[PDB]
Amino acid sequence: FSSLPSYAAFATAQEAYEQAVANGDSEVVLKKLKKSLNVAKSEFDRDAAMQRKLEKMADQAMTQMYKQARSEDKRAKVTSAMQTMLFTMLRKLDNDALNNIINNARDGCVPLNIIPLTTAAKLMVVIPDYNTYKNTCDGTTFTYASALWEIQQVVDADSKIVQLSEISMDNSPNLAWPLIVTALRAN
C-alpha cells in the first residue's frame, strides 16, 4: 500500500511534528507528537500489514480456480478418447455369425470363451520348434476347432517373412524359431 488514507495522515502528522521539533517549543510538544506518530503508525500497521492477507487469499483462490479448470478439461478429453475407442472396436463384431449363435441361446447368454472360437475370421498360431510345426500347421490347409483354415504369410521372431519351402528338417537350424502362422477361415 502506498496511496491509502492512513498514509497521508501519518506523513503530514510526522512532517508537522518534526517541523515543530525544529522549532523546539515545549516538553509536552515532544510527547504529543510522539503519541500522534505512535497512533498514526498504529493506523499504518493495520492498513498496511493486515491489508495484505486479502491479496494472498485472493491469489490462493485464483490458483485453485486455474487448477479446477485444467482438471475439468482433462476429464472431457479422456471421455472422448474412451468412447471413440469403444465405437471403433464395435464396428468389427456386428457380423451375422454372432447373431446366429446369440439367437441359438435359450436366454441370450453365452460363454465368452466360445465367441472367438466360432466367429473369428483369422487365426494365429505360435510354434516353438519343427516337430510341433509338423504336427499342427502342415501343408497349405489344416483343420482346427471343427473348422478348416488356409495359410497366408509366415513370419519369425524378427518379423521377417518366411516361405513355406524353407521350413524343412535340414534348414531348421537357420531360422529364428518362434514361428507365427496366419490363416483364414475357409467356407
Binding site: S71, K74, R75, V78, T79, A81, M82, Q83, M85, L86, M89, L90, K92, L93, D94, L98, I102, G108, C109, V110, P111, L112, N113, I114, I115, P116, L117, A120, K122, L123, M124, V125, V126, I127, P128, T132, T136, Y144, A145, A157, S159, P178, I180, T182
Partner: protein, 620 residues
C-alpha cells in the same frame, strides 16, 4: 469344497464371464452380465438395462475395463509354447520383451580396490548382479502356473482351523469408509490395461468426484465386474538368473478394494506387540522389542524357520477364499449378507481367475495369488497362520494317546477329536482353550509368508506340538509341493537370534549399559548395490551422495562383527562419502568461485549420526 471336485468333469470353455447383447443409442454392444465360477457356481447381475440412451462417465469406465469387447473383436489364438488356456490375440503381431544389463560404477570399484578389497581368498566377494533376459522370458515365466492344481480339502478340519485363525485376528477393527477418507500414496503409477493408454492413476482420481466413486462402490455390491491384469518384467538386482514378473491390476479394481479393506489394513499396520508384525520398524530398538516379544515365556525354547516353494503359484483356491472371508468378517454392521457375497465374487473374478494380458494376447489364469492387488501381504499372513495351525492339529491327533503321560494333554486330544468329527457347530470354550495352549507352547512372529517360531522342545520331541516334518507332510498333501529340509533351519541357543528373518542376521552386542539385539545384512548385497546401477542414478557420485548415506545407514551394524573384513564396508562407505563431498566442493570453487558458507555436513562422515539410528530413543 464340493464344487471344486465336481467342476473337473465339465468342459473348460464353459467357465468365465457370460455375455449378452444390449442396445445403447440404437447400436448393439456385447457386455458381461454374469459369471460362471469353478467354486461358486452361476452368478447373475442384478442391474442390467437394455435400451440405454447414452453412457455416463462411470458406465464408460465399466464398459472399457470389460474383457468382453476386447476378446470379441480380436483374432483367434493357438499358442503352443504354454499349456494354459488362450483366448484371443489383440493385434496382428506378437511382442517379445527383453531385460537389459546393469551399469558399472567404475569409480567406486577403483576406490574399493585401492583400499584392499576383492583380494584372492577374501571372504567378501560380489554375488549380486543384474541378469539379462532374452525375448522368450515373459511367456516362459507365465508358464509356471502349471503348478496350480485342483485341491479338495478336509472340510471338518478346515472349519475348526478357520475359527482358531480368526481368533488370531481379534484385536483389530474394520468396516467400510467413504471416498473422502481414502489415502492414496504415489498417485503417479500405472493404471492397468485400457487405462494406461490415456494417463496414470492421478487422471482417474482427478476426473471422478467423491460421488462417482461412491456410486461405483455401491454398484460393486450388486454386480460383478471382471477385469484384465497385465504382466510386467522386473529390472532389479538379484543373486539368481531367474526372471521376475509383477502383476498390474486395473484401476477399477483397486479403487473399490481400497474402500473395502483399508480401515482394517491400517488398523493392523499400527499395532505393536501382536503376532503379525507388519508396520513395525527395526530402528530405534524395534528389532530387540520384536525378538523379546516372540521369545515370550516358552519353557524349553528352540527357534525354527521353514520355507514355501513356489508360494504364489501353488496356493490352492480354497485357502485364498478362506483368507478373503477371514478378512471380510469385520463387516458385520455395515454390509448385509448379499453385499458380502457379491464382494467376494468380485474379488474372485478380479484377482483369482481373471484374464491376463501377456505380450499382446489374453490368457486364462488357473488360480493362485496375483502379487499386485491391494491385499497381498495380509492374505499371505492369514495363509501362513492357517498352515501352522493345521500342522499343530495334525501333530497332536496322530499321536498314540495311551503313551501321553500328562492327563491335561490327553483330555485336550480327546476333546479335539470330538470337536472336529463329532460336533457340527462352533464350540467357543474349546477354541479359547486351544488358542491359549498354542500361544503358550508355540509362539510365532509372522510377516507376509515369512515366519519365526519359538517352541517347547520337550513337547515337540513327544509329538505334542508341530515339528519340522509335520510341515512337510501338510505341504505335501495340502499344497502339492515338496519342502526340502535344506531351506529350513533350527536354533538351540537363544543368545543368538534367528538364523534368518527378512534377509537379516541377528547379533547380540553391548550398547551402553546393557546387551541388545541388532540386525545386519549380507555384505555382498551392500557392495553390489554400490557397484551396479541404472545410469545417472550413479556413475557420478557427486550428483546424488544421499544414496551412499542410506547404504551406510543400512550397513552400520557390521562394525560390531568379529570378522574384520566386515567393518571395512562401513569404513569404506564413510571414506567415499568424504571424498565425494570434497570433489563437489572443489569443482564448485574451481568453476564459479563459490563456497558453501556453513557445511553442517561433516556429520555424514562421522559415525555418531549412524550410531544414533539403532538406540532406543525415537527421533524420526
Amino acid at each position: 469344497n464340493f464344487n471344486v471336485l465336481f467342476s473337473t468333469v465339465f468342459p473348460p470353455t464353459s467357465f468365465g464371464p457370460l455375455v449378452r447383447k444390449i442396445f445403447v443409442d440404437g447400436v448393439p454392444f456385447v457386455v458381461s452380465t454374469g459369471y460362471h465360477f469353478r467354486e461358486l457356481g452361476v452368478v447373475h447381475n442384478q442391474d442390467v438395462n437394455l435400451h440405454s440412451s447414452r453412457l455416463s462417465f462411470k458406465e464408460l469406465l465399466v464398459y472399457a475395463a470389460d474383457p468382453a469387447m476386447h476378446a470379441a473383436s480380436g483374432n483367434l489364438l493357438l499358442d503352443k509354447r504354454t499349456t494354459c488356456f488362450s483366448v484371443a490375440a489383440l493385434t496382428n503381431n506378437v511382442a517379445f520383451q527383453t531385460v537389459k544389463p546393469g551399469n558399472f560404477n567404475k569409480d567406486f570399484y577403483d576406490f574399493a580396490v585401492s583400499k584392499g578389497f576383492f583380494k584372492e581368498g577374501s571372504s567378501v566377494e560380489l554375488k549380486h548382479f543384474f541378469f539379462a533376459q532374452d525375448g522368450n522370458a515373459a511367456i516362459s515365466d507365465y508358464d509356471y502356473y502349471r503348478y496350480n492344481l485342483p485341491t479338495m480339502c478336509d472340510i471338518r478340519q478346515l472349519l475348526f482351523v478357520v475359527e482358531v485363525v480368526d481368533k488370531y485376528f481379534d484385536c483389530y477393527d474394520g468396516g467400510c469408509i467413504n471416498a473422502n477418507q481414502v489415502i492414496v500414496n504415489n498417485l503417479d503409477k500405472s493404471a492397468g490395461f485400457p487405462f494406461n493408454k490415456w494417463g496414470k492413476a492421478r487422471l482417474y482420481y482427478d476426473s471422478m468426484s467423491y460421488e462417482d466413486q461412491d456410486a461405483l462402490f455401491a454398484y460393486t455390491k450388486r454386480n460383478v465386474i471382471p477385469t484384465i491384469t497385465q504382466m510386467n518384467l522386473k529390472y532389479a538386482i538379484s543373486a539368481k538368473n531367474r526372471a521376475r514378473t509383477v502383476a498390474g491390476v486395473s484401476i477399477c479394481s483397486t479403487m473399490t478394494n481400497r474402500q473395502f479393506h483399508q480401515k482394517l489394513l491400517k488398523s493392523i499396520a499400527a499395532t505393536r506387540g501382536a503376532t503379525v508384525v507388519i508396520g513395525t520398524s527395526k530402528f530405534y530398538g524395534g528389532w530387540h522389542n520384536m525378538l523379546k516379544t516372540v521369545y515370550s515365556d516358552v519353557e524349553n525354547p528352540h527357534l525354527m524357520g521353514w520355507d514355501y516353494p513356489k508360494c504364489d503359484r501353488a496356493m490352492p483356491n480354497m485357502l485364498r477364499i478362506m483368507a478373503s472371508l477371514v478378512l471380510a468378517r469385520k463387516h458385520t454392521t455395515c454390509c448385509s449378507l448379499s453385499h458380502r457375497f457379491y464382494r467376494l465374487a468380485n474379488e474372485c473374478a478380479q484377482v483369482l481367475s481373471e484374464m491376463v494380458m501377456c505380450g499382446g494376447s489374453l490368457y486364462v489364469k488357473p488360480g493362485g495369488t496375483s502379487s499386485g492387488d491391494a491385499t497381498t501381504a495380509y492374505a499371505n499372513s492369514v495363509f501362513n497362520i492357517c498352515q501352522a495351525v493345521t500342522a499343530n492339529v495334525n501333530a497332536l491327533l496322530s499321536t498314540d494317546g495311551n503313551k501321553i503321560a500328562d492327563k491335561y494333554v490327553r483330555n485336550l486330544q480327546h476333546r479335539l477329536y470330538e470337536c472336529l468329527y463329532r460336533n457340527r457347530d462352533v464350540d467357543t470354550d474349546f477354541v479359547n482353550e486351544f488358542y491359549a495352549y498354542l500361544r503358550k507352547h508355540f509362539s510365532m512372529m509372522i510377516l507376509s509368508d515369512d515366519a519365526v517360531v519359538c517352541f517347547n522342545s520337550t513337547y515337540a520331541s513327544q509329538g505334542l506340538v508341530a515339528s519340522i516334518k509335520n510341515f512337510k507332510s501338510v505341504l505335501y498333501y495340502q499344497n502339492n509341493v515338496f519342502m526340502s529340509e535344506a531351506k529350513c533351519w533350527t536354533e538351540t541357543d537363544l543368545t543368538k537370534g534367528p538364523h534368518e528373518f527378512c534377509s537379516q542376521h541377528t547379533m547380540l552386542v553391548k550398547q551402553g549399559d546393557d546387551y541388545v539385539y541388532l540386525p545386519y545384512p549380507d555384505p555382498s548385497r551392500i557392495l553390489g548395490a554400490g557397484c551396479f546401477v541404472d545410469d545417472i542414478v550413479k556413475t557420478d557420485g557427486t550428483l546424488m551422495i544421499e544414496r551412499f548415506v542410506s547404504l551406510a545407514i543400512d550397513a552400520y551394524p557390521l562394525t560390531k562383527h568379529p570378522n574384520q573384513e566386515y567393518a571395512d564396508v562401513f569404513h569404506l562407505y564413510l571414506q567415499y562419502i568424504r571424498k565425494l563431498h570434497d570433489e563437489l566442493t572443489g569443482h564448485m570453487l574451481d568453476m564459479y568461485s563459490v563456497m558453501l558458507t556453513n557445511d553442517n555436513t561433516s556429520r555424514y562422515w562421522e559415525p555418531e549420526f549412524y550410531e544414533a539410528m539403532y538406540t532406543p530413543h525415537t527421533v524420526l
